Curated annotation (Swiss-Prot), chain B:
It comes from the Viruses. Attaches the virion to the cell membrane by interacting with host receptor, initiating the infection. The major receptor is host ACE2. When S2/S2' has been cleaved, binding to the receptor triggers direct fusion at the cell membrane. When S2/S2' has not been cleaved, binding to the receptor results in internalization of the virus by endocytosis using host TFRC and GRM2 and leading to fusion of the virion membrane with the host endosomal membrane. Alternatively, may use NRP1/NRP2 and integrin as entry receptors. It comes from Severe acute respiratory syndrome coronavirus 2 (2019-nCoV). This is Spike protein S1. Binds to host ACE2. RBD also interacts with the N-linked glycan on 'Asn-90' of ACE2. Cleavage of S generates a polybasic C-terminal sequence on S1 that binds to host Neuropilin-1 (NRP1) and Neuropilin-2 (NRP2) receptors. Interacts with host integrin alpha-5/beta-1 (ITGA5:ITGB1) and with ACE2 in complex with integrin alpha-5/beta-1 (ITGA5:ITGB1). May interact via cytoplasmic c-terminus with M protein. May interact (via N-terminus) with host bilirubin and biliverdin, thereby preventing antibody binding to the SARS-CoV-2 spike NTD via an allosteric mechanism.
Length: 49, 24
């Protein structure tokens, strides 16, 4: 890689984030916080997305 | 040497809980 060359020849750093999107307990999460849990009432919910 | 597998060598295909079902 030479610093003079046109952009398509210039180096790009690449990362591929690849998701283990399994129905198995999540080790990784977003910034979102939990509420407290509630039972035996009609509610909207989210578990791990 | 040799033997027959009979009915062995199945495994849980996925981490889903299922019950009382004839899954395919």
């Amino acid at each position: 890689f030479q610093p003079t060359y046109g952009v398509g020849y210039q180096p790009y750093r690449v990362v591929v984030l690849s998701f283990e999107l399994l129905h198995a307990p999540a080790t990784v999460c977003g910034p979102k916080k939990s509420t407290n849990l509630v039972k035996n009432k009609c509610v909207n919910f989210n578990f791990n997305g | 040497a040799y033997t027959n597998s009979f009915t062995r060598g199945v495994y849980y295909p996925d981490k889903v809980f299922r019950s009382s079902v004839l899954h395919s």
